């Protein structure tokens, strides 16, 4: 019933997110985006941004369909896939989805956008009795996850201007506006 | 309580509860586009090496475990489109000849506990790793015992291989479970 427990849970999930995904995809991400831009997206104001944008809703409410969370977020395409032999599974697949961000009926941005999948584990553990966690535990673990992940990425050699965390609290809220603000701060 | 609790819950929530309900069907679609060769056990076999030593290719754990084929892929839109869930069908050799076939893999979260033991910023000792590996196994087993998505469709094999022990055949151990099952 302590924070040390809320800390250990988030610490492990943040490391898992780095070890099993970010350290493996971030190094070839900008090649994949550059490839996409050069070959399949010659739109001079429509280029896919060079960073993976990771949505960290602090209530850990993660829809599976991002486009449905905002009429102004439209699925556009997938990057070229990346495969790996992982833990005795041949060709485990790593894929990333490109979204268009609309504003005043116009395209305002294009980016690789996704929620941090591990927040779904923090939500489930808040909902399942066997896991033994309260909403207040979930909110603490979500904050500790984002902080651990930032500290990890700040020192990680695979993170070099290719990743951006978007943490926010969540009706009146536009997720596209939340991402557009971060995107527009890049260039 | 600790790191393993989140890892065990993550493995159930993000993988087992999603793939196990559909596993039985995928194995039939495989057997309909393979009976003359030998049927694949209808259960996902998950290896839990407690030393957290998890080669990405199983033949390097034991050369008698050979990749035969990949089961039909399962794709799911997850956390924002067509995330692919893939599984690998292996043959187990006895005296250079196929003794069995199953869907077989390591529990990937054990590689996290290993890499955490290796990164200074994780503050994770090798004693922490063994302790957390056992907690992972027990937490996962406790979850799967009450999980509705596990209806005789999964088998966990937890084991401690001591250092440099030629007395251990992973192939034989899996075959022992496969032979016990058919009985
Ligand atoms: N965004 C993202 N894409 C990835 O491809 C990926 N891969 C690992 N991770 C995270 O990195 C951390 C450590 O990973 P790990 O392998 O160590 O532990 C895993 C693993 O044992 C098992 N498991 C999970 C997956 C899996 C498949 C697809 C997605 C996904 C999610 C959002 C997307 C958004 C857009 C496009 C594509 C998207 C794809 C996520 C997980 C998986 C698989 N395909 N085959 C075999 N076993 C599997 O369940 C454990 C917990 O899974 P969790 O879902 O919580 O997400 C894990 C985890 O938190 C990923 N995140």
3D structure, described in words:
Chain B: It comes from Homo sapiens (Human). Chain B: Belongs to the STING family. Chain B: This is Stimulator of interferon genes protein. The structure is a homodimer. Chain A folds into two domains: about 50 residues, no CATH class; about 140 residues, no CATH class. The first copy, chain A, contains four helices and seven strands; from the N terminus they run αββββββααβα. In chain A, strands 2-5-6-1-7 form a five-stranded mixed sheet. In chain A, strands 3-4 form a two-stranded antiparallel sheet. The radius of gyration of chain A is 17 Å and the shape is globular. The complex binds ligand KWF. Ligand KWF sits at the interface of chains A and B.
Radius of gyration over C-alpha positions of chain A, nearest whole angstrom: 17 Å
Q: How far is the N terminus from the C terminus of chain A?
A: 45 Å
The largest pleated sheet of chain A is described as: 5 strands, mixed
By DSSP (H or I, 4+ residues per run), the number of helices of chain A equals 4
Largest interface: A-B, 51 and 51 residues
Oligomerization status of the protein chains: homodimer
**Helix vs. strand class of chain A:** alpha/beta
Looking at the structure, what is the overall shape of chain A? globular
Summarize the structure.
The structure is a homodimer. With 187 residues, chain A is an alpha/beta fold.
How is this fold's topology laid out?
The structure is a homodimer.
Chain A: H1 3-40, E1 52-57, E2 73-78, E3 82-86, E4 89-94, E5 97-103, E6 106-115, H2 118-127, H3 135-155, E7 163-168, H4 175-186
Parallel strand pairs in A: 1-6, 1-7
Antiparallel strand pairs in A: 2-5, 3-4, 5-6
Helix pairs in contact in A: 1-3, 2-3
Binding site for 2',3'-cUAMP (chain A): 21, 92, 117
Binding site for 3',3'-c-di-GMP (chain A): 16, 21, 92-95, 117
Cross-link (Glycyl lysine isopeptide (Lys-Gly) (interchain with G-Cter in ubiquitin)) (chain A): 4, 90
